[PDB]
Amino acid sequence: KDIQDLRTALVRGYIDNVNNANYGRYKALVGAYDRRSLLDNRPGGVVEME
């Protein structure tokens, strides 16, 4: 029994880690939003200004 529980916990840990890493949130400042360019997700045309 314990083993099972234990493993689950560990597994859960692993899972949640990945369950966050896949979000891929980006940190940024204030004077670099450029919503038109940022929201636009195309291979080319992004503006990492400032």
Binding site: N19, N20, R35, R36, L38, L39, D40
Partner: protein, 227 residues
């Protein structure tokens, strides 16, 4: 001997106090105190963002369209009267791609002077009647909280939340433009520094009432319904 009251709470007493802290009693200067206060209030509200000047209003979506109110400066959380469902802002190039390539999240943009929602949500306004009856909010409603711009005084007895909270703010910021009118530099510097310090204190106060009472660790786990 222009005498003002201790609880500065109106426009006339503020005008008299401005004319007092600038002892000069002359028509050339007194007749422009309104202009200085106008410049000050237009300098403060142009970038001040705090709760008390916020406002809530129901929209009137017809078909995935809308119109921004004439008193709109900045928008914050929007949602519906039921179940919540906070909306999230996007860009035109995405809210126009959703239609082509598209349980149901919501998105909205700003096409100059029109909010454009993708799902084509429908909204309704409440019962208008002024016969001392409640508004009777309507079903399928959407709530919007924005930082409304306050109206100009244009009257002596008129007042505002600032006169009660921070009258020194407007006092110093209008004495700034006054000491700019007349060539007085040191006074301009002093009044500007004091107004800046007051505004800094205010914005810091607005920050220490935010989501502070809790640890910043244990990042949330709003992953999905799939465990």
């Amino acid at each position: 001997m222009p005498d003002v009251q201790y609880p500065i709470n109106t426009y006339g007493w503020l005008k008299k106090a401005v004319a007092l802290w600038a002892d000069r009693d002359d028509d050339e200067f007194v007749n422009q105190i309104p202009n200085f206060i106008n410049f000050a209030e237009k300098e403060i509200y142009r970038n001040l963002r705090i709760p008390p000047l916020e406002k809530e209003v129901y929209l009137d979506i017809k078909d995935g369209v809308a119109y921004i109110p004439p008193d709109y400066l900045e928008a914050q959380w929007m949602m519906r009267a039921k179940d919540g469902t906070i909306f999230q802002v996007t860009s035109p190039e995405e809210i126009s791609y959703r239609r082509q390539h598209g349980n149901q999240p919501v998105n909205f943009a700003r096409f100059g002077s029109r909010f454009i929602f993708y799902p084509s949500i429908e909204a309704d306004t409440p019962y208008y009647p002024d016969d001392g009856s409640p508004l009777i909010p309507a079903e399928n409603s959407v709530i919007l909280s924005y930082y409304a711009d306050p109206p100009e005084f244009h009257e002596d007895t008129d007042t505002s939340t600032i006169l009660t909270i921070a009258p020194e703010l407007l006092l110093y910021f209008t004495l700034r433009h006054a000491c700019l009118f007349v060539q007085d530099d040191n006074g301009v510097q002093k009044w500007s520094a004091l107004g800046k310090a007051i505004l800094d204190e205010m914005v810091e106060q607005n920050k220490k009432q935010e989501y502070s009472g809790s640890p910043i660790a244990i990042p949330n786990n709003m992953t999905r319904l799939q465990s």
